[PDB]
């Protein structure tokens, strides 16, 4: 029915709901349990320890 | 070089194969130092140095490196015109479809992929989806599924189909498409459908599809994955004066599209959510159709200016595009531009030319002389010693143009007389001197007009200016064959005023010896100029077998008539000169001069009588004055008649007798009447006179009157002019067409009050806009008709051919309108003439029927004969000399080569803005229409007959009752369908009536087969025919307008090219103007060259092609000599316009108009243009194949075909 | 005004236009179309070539003129050069056969 | 030109044939047949043709000639 992008742009955006300050805490705790899932998963690997060892050997030296 | 241009689809390979690189930056050039960035758009390292065999870094620099990369910039070292030459590519993040494969319409994808247009945008702006693999899945390919929908059967299949959005959907659709699949499919449903419009659709889809598979493009290549980037010196960036920069549009949408394509890039490695991915890929193919075509997609983006910014497209159509102000026109070198005099003492081929003004313009061959002579060592030396102005400067221009022709031209320039050679003399001043028996041709008068000059350089052009292009040459007019260098003016009125005849005047009754003693009784005041005396002529005549006889003998003639003889050359009869001579007669001489003396004889006769008429206008003294506007005493006395007479109607009015439309009308016709006999009146005192002669009796005399003499001479002048100087002006009209009750009944020399100047004012301003704006209507349709026409050259001698056209003088009443020997001047006749009621042969084939045999012909009394005809030639390309006949500028046979079509155009398009029952003989009647016919045999009366006095067979005696413009043309030439046009009879049967359908009736036609065709009629129809009656194929049913398609169908060629014909040279006729029939005969076989291929036969051609006629012609004769079968047609006439743009040949179509559709439908098809034409080859720079490069052009077909 | 060598275009490779430029006359399409109708092909072949825009074409016929040889070895002209070099730039494959 | 384009028939040809004598008498060391009377060469050529001198067939029997030396 239209032929500039922008209106359909503006068409797209606007069939979300806008959200609340409780909407804002519960994505950013669902992207901080993201976030803490994946540093578990590279935690359980025999290679990834040592080298924040030495990093902070490295790191401690000045 | 090169012999063909081809077109077509670029595939990725090819646009990175023109590209020296990948542009990836939007970058120009530095901020301070003002070099170019690299991987920008003006990169050194991808489009070539900026100097001459330099790069960047300044370590190779000079020639010795030519060639070499320097390892730390990567700069060639070359030449810098490298950067008009290399191009760029920009690998795009997502494919793009291209605008003029998707806009233009048809659109090729749309209907490649036979779905609609708008679902094709809805996919690309990113709003449905497109099935593309459906695998083991209900789904078909094409069907549009929604957001919601793609989820749901996602949901419930899963990886089984595919499912895609954009640009690239639309590229798996047309990648995998079967194309000999798909034409077999629709040859098979061809055959087997029963709806003629469904055959239309499914056969432009065929042609399509069959056109991508012969071309070898693939249809995958309209969408573009690789964006071509042109060089950066033909989108330059350059300094002007205080730092300023100077940028072309192209700059700015190239930095759109690598913005965003990097932006779709970044967007696509940073994780984005999916509307963001769309909306740049919205974003990515807007930037890209603005880029190939701004305004088409929808808002056209503007600049900082806020205009629109100008794209590719723009840059290569229009009338301000290349095509047209760079191709087919240019601005030259060595030309000049100045003012133009009057030079009454040059010759015909001398044109005055200022010494400065060729100094400048024939400067290098001044430098080669002082180099040769020796008076300079170098050039520097040549430079300074001609800025420095020597005498032996002079002496060498003086020498240089001794005989070096220099071309004139005025613009406009609307025939090929507006550009003509002349010798150059130097003359001390600043204004060009042009002779003035050309001004007629070039439409110049000496008011301020300008024209400019330009000086042809090798031996070729020279003597094309000495051969064809010298005004000697051309004093014929092509349009119509008359001369074009007559007398006007004051050369008429001193022609006039020396042949005058006086009663009573000195010397009269004397004797003179011959023309040398009548210019010594002059000179010595003896006897005057109109004195009446007996003079010893001697008179030579040449006859038309070339005998020479004189005889001398004593004629009653006045002085100045032997004076006048003492300068016609011998061969002529004194009767041209023994009357008094205007405009027209001085016409008749050069006409006679030129037919029986020749072209030498004529231009040297057009000087002495040029010399002599401005002489003896001199002479004369005539003057205007304030007395010479004589007012009939009548006309005071008429007025007042007038006046009561109005007031008595309309006191009559008053008494309710008749209405105020009657009133009005009677009022203007008395008003006509009034205004009608005060002309006569002021005519009658005017023109006459009362003199003394030598007896004493009071003698009527013609009047000396200078407006009367400048009138009835034809120098400047007319009925009209005089009736308003000194009668009535009359009836002026109200802007809207309306005639003002009351008119003005005051002329020039008493003077008008206010509101009959403002009534004047009313109809002034509308005739200057009129003619405003009809010049420019003139202007377009000279140029259709160019273009129409340009390809029709002489290429052949005989043609081989039997067909003709009949031709019979031209009859709308009881009068005749043309001679037989008018139309049949210059023409080759096709049968042999035989005498009417005899079978002897007066006149054999192939011959031209000169102003002898026309003689022949109009005494032995021809009625109709027939004659070659440009139509009817069965040439290949071009038209033959014979069919074509006698050029009229030239007065021979046409010779091998001539643009006879360009020559027609201009000939039509010329006086454009000129433009805007009882028998009265005795003879026979005859039935066909009326035909009376005199005891001669010709038929001089042609008369409707209305469905008599007198049976047929039956004689008639005399007085017996037996009982805007421009446009026509435009219109006639366009072959525009009439808004109620005459329903014609398409078939031989009898009529009958049928079911009165609601809304429009139908009628019902039976053929001799016992076919029934059913007819569509409107109701609001005069039906004229009635049932049970049989109607012969193109009867009128119903009254109106023919349409040309409708003739052409029904009736055969020569009908309609007759129809044609008639109607341009009635409109043309009506004006007073005078063209040959054979350019419009030129124009109608240009409207006549393709065909609908009716029956396949099996040449290749499906049925309802519109094919074009020459290639038929060809394949049946190949056809016949295998004995195989051959195919049949329909003929159809195209406008002037369509016709245009249907030629074969899509670089005249593109630079015609219509650029995008042309150039989109040619490079889908795969064209190749062989440039045969001249448009082309003018377009190319090679010689035009027509007049002296038309041999050029025929050794390459000599080396083609070996 | 009068011009027998100056200055050219940027783009076009063509003589300027004006009197304050010191350019040349325009040879529009009309006087095209009357140099056909008279069938002076070597003229018209001047007029566009090597006046114009064939940049090696005029060069020479300057030095032919300087030299006294009154001959032009024509060329292609620029503007088809450049009208080729936009053709390709809107992905159409435009080309010369031999 | 009138004598001229009489004796070849065709301008065009006399075009052609008088361009290719007069760059002999130019560019060549070929001498007028018919006295110069301080005329250029494409006049030069133009007279002689008028002559009948110089034709197409002429100058292609010359140009054989002087192949063949
Ligand atoms: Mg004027
Ligand atoms: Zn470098
Ligand atoms: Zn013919």
């Not at chain 1, 994505?27 to 990834?48: C, F, H, L, M, W």
């Not at chain 2, 020796?374 to 221009?397: F, N, P, S």
């Not at chain 2, 032995?860 to 440009?870: A, E, F, G, P």
């Not at chain 4, 050529?45 to 063949?68: F, N, P, W, Y």
Request: hydrophobic share 40%; proline share 4%.
């Amino acid at each position: 029915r239209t032929t500039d992008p922008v209106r359909m742009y503006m068409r797209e955006m606007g069939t979300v709901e806008l959200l609340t300050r409780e909407g804002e805490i519960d994505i950013a705790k669902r992207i901080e349990d993201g976030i803490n899932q994946v540093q578990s998963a590279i935690a359980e690997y025999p290679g990834t320890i040592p080298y924040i060892l030495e990093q902070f050997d490295r790191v401690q030296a000045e | 070089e090169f012999d063909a241009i081809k077109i077509g689809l670029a595939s990725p390979d090819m646009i990175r194969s023109w590209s020296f690189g990948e542009v990836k930056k939007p970058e120009t050039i530095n901020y301070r130092t003002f070099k170019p960035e690299r991987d920008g758009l003006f990169c050194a390292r991808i489009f070539g140095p900026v100097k001459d065999y330099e790069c960047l870094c300044g370590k190779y620099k000079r020639l010795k490196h030519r060639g070499v990369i320097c390892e730390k910039c990567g700069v060639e070292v070359t030449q810098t015109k490298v950067r008009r030459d290399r191009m760029g590519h920009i690998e795009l993040a997502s494919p793009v479809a291209h605008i003029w494969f998707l806009k233009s319409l048809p659109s090729r994808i749309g209907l490649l992929m036979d779905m609609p247009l708008r679902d094709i945008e809805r996919v690309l702006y990113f709003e449905m989806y497109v099935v593309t693999e459906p695998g083991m899945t209900d789904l078909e390919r094409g069907q549009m599924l929604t957001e919601e929908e793609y989820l749901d059967r996602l949901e419930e299949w899963g990886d089984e189909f595919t499912a895609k959005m954009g640009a690239e959907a639309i590229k798996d659709l047309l990648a995998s498409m079967d194309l000999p699949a798909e034409a077999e499919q629709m040859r098979e449903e061809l055959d087997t459908t029963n709806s003629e419009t469904k055959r239309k659709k499914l056969t432009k889809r065929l042609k399509l599809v069959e056109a991508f598979v012969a071309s070898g493009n693939k249809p995958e290549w309209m969408i573009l994955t690789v964006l071509p980037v042109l060089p950066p010196d033909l989108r330059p960036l350059v300094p002007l004066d205080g730092g300023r920069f100077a940028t072309s549009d192209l700059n700015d949408l190239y930095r759109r599209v690598i913005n965003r394509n990097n932006r779709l890039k970044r967007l696509l490695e940073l994780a984005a959510p999916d509307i963001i991915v769309r909306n740049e890929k919205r974003m990515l193919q807007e930037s890209v159709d603005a880029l190939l075509d701004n305004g088409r997609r929808g808002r056209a983006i503007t600049g900082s200016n806020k205009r629109p910014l100008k794209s590719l497209a723009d840059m290569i159509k229009g009338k301000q595009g290349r095509f047209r102000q760079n191709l087919l026109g240019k601005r030259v070198d060595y030309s000049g531009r100045s003012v133009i005099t009057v030079g009454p003492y040059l010759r015909l081929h001398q044109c005055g030319l200022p010494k400065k003004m060729a100094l400048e313009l024939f400067k290098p061959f001044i430098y080669s002389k002082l180099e040769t002579r020796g008076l300079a060592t170098t050039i520097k030396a040549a430079k300074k010693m001609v800025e420095r102005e020597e005498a032996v400067v002079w002496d060498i221009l003086d020498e240089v143009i001794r005989e070096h022709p220099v071309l004139l031209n005025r613009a406009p320039t609307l025939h090929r007389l507006g550009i003509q050679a002349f010798e150059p003399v130097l003359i001390e001043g600043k204004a060009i001197q042009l002779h003035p028996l050309v001004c007629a041709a070039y439409n110049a008068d000496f008011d301020g007009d300008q024209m400019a000059v330009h000086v042809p350089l090798t031996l070729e052009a020279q003597l094309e200016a000495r051969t064809l292009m010298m005004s000697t040459n051309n004093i014929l007019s092509p349009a119509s064959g008359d001369p074009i260098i007559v007398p006007s003016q004051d050369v008429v009125l001193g022609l006039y005023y020396m042949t005058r005849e006086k009663i009573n005047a000195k010397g009269e009754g004397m004797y003179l010896t011959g023309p040398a003693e009548a210019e010594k009784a002059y000179r010595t005041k003896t006897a005057e100029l109109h004195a009446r005396v007996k003079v010893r002529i001697t008179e030579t005549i040449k006859h038309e077998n070339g005998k020479l006889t004189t005889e001398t003998k004593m004629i009653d003639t006045t002085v100045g008539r032997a004076m006048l003889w003492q300068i016609v050359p011998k061969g002529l009869p004194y009767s041209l000169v023994n009357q008094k001579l205007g405009k027209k007669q001085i016409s008749n001489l050069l006409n006679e001069a030129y037919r029986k003396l020749g072209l030498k004889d004529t231009v040297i006769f057009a000087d002495q009588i040029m010399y002599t008429g401005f002489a003896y206008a001199a002479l004369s003294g005539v003057s205007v004055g304030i007395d010479d506007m004589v007012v009939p005493a009548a006309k005071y006395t008429e007025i007042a008649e007038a006046e009561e007479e109005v007031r008595e109607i309309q006191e009559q009015f008053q008494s309710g007798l008749v209405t105020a439309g009657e009133r009005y009308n009677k009022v203007i016709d008395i008003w006509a009447s009034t205004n009608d006999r005060v002309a006569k009146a002021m005519m009658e005192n005017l023109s006459s006179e009362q003199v003394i002669n030598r007896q004493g009796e009071q003698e009527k005399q013609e009047s000396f009157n200078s407006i009367y003499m400048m009138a009835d001479s034809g120098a400047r002048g007319s009925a009209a002019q005089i009736r308003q100087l000194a009668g009535m002006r009359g009836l002026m009209a109200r802007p809207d067409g309306s005639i003002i009750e009351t008119p003005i009944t005051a002329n020039f020399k008493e003077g008008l009050n206010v509101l009959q100047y403002f009534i004047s004012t009313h109809g002034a301003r509308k005739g200057l806009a009129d003619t405003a704006l009809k010049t420019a209507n003139s202007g377009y349709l000279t140029r259709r008709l160019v273009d129409v026409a340009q390809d029709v050259v002489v290429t052949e001698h005989d043609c081989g051919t039997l067909e003709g056209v009949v031709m019979t003088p031209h009859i709308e009443g009881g009068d005749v309108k043309v001679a037989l020997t008018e139309l049949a001047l210059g023409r080759v006749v096709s049968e042999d003439i035989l005498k009417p009621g005899t079978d002897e042969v007066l006149i054999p084939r192939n011959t031209l029927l000169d102003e002898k045999w026309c003689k022949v012909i109009n005494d032995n009394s021809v009625d109709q004969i027939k004659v070659r005809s440009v139509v009817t030639c069965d040439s290949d390309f071009g038209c033959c000399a014979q069919c074509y006949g006698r050029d009229l500028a030239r007065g021979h046979l046409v010779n091998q080569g001539e643009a006879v079509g360009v020559i027609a155009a201009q000939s039509i398009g010329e006086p454009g803005t000129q433009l805007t029952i009882q028998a009265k003989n005795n003879g026979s009647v005859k039935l066909h229409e009326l035909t009376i016919i005199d005891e001669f045999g010709r038929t001089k009366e042609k008369h409707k007959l209305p469905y008599l006095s007198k049976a047929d067979g039956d004689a008639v005696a005399a007085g017996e009752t037996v009982a805007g413009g421009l446009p026509r043309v435009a219109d006639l030439f366009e072959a525009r369908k009439p808004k109620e046009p005459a329903i014609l009879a398409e078939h031989s049967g009898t009529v009958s009536f049928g079911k009165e359908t609601k809304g429009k009736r139908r009628l019902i036609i039976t053929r001799d087969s016992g076919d029934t065709y059913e007819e569509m009629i409107p109701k609001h129809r005069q039906l004229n025919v009635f049932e049970g009656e049989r109607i012969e194929r193109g009867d009128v049913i119903a009254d109106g307008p023919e349409s040309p398609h409708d003739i052409l169908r029904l009736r055969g060629i020569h009908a309609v090219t007759t129809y044609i014909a008639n109607e341009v040279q009635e409109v043309y006729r009506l004006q007073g103007v005078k063209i040959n029939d054979k350019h419009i005969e030129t124009i109608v076989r240009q409207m006549l060259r393709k065909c609908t291929i009716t029956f396949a036969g099996d040449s290749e051609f499906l049925p309802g092609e519109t094919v074009e006629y020459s290639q038929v012609k060809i394949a049946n004769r190949k056809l016949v000599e295998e004995g195989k079968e051959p195919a049949r047609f329909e003929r159809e006439l195209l406008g002037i316009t369509k016709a245009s743009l249907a030629t074969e040949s899509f670089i005249s179509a593109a630079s015609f108009q219509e650029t995008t559709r042309v150039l989109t439908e040619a490079a889908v098809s795969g064209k190749r243009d062989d440039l045969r034409g001249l448009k082309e080859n003018v377009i190319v720079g090679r010689l035009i194949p027509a007049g002296t490069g038309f041999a050029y052009h025929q050794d390459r077909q000599a080396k083609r075909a070996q | 005004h009068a011009r027998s060598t100056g200055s050219y275009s940027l783009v076009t490779q063509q003589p300027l236009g004006g009197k304050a430029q010191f350019g040349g006359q325009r040879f529009g399409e009309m006087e095209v179309w009357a140099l056909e109708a008279y069938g002076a092909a070597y003229t018209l072949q001047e007029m566009l070539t090597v006046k114009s825009d064939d940049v090696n074409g005029r060069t020479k016929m300057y030095k032919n003129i300087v030299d006294g040889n009154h001959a032009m070895e024509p060329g292609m002209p620029e503007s088809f050069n450049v009208l080729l070099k936009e053709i390709r730039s809107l992905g159409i494959n435009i080309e010369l056969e031999d | 030109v009138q004598d001229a384009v009489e004796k070849i028939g065709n301008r065009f040809d006399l075009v052609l044939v008088a361009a290719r004598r007069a760059r002999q008498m130019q560019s060549g060391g070929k001498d007028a047949l018919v006295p110069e009377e301080n005329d250029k060469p494409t006049v030069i050529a133009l007279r002689e043709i008028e002559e009948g001198l110089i034709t197409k067939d002429v100058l292609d029997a010359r140009e054989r000639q002087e192949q063949q030396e």
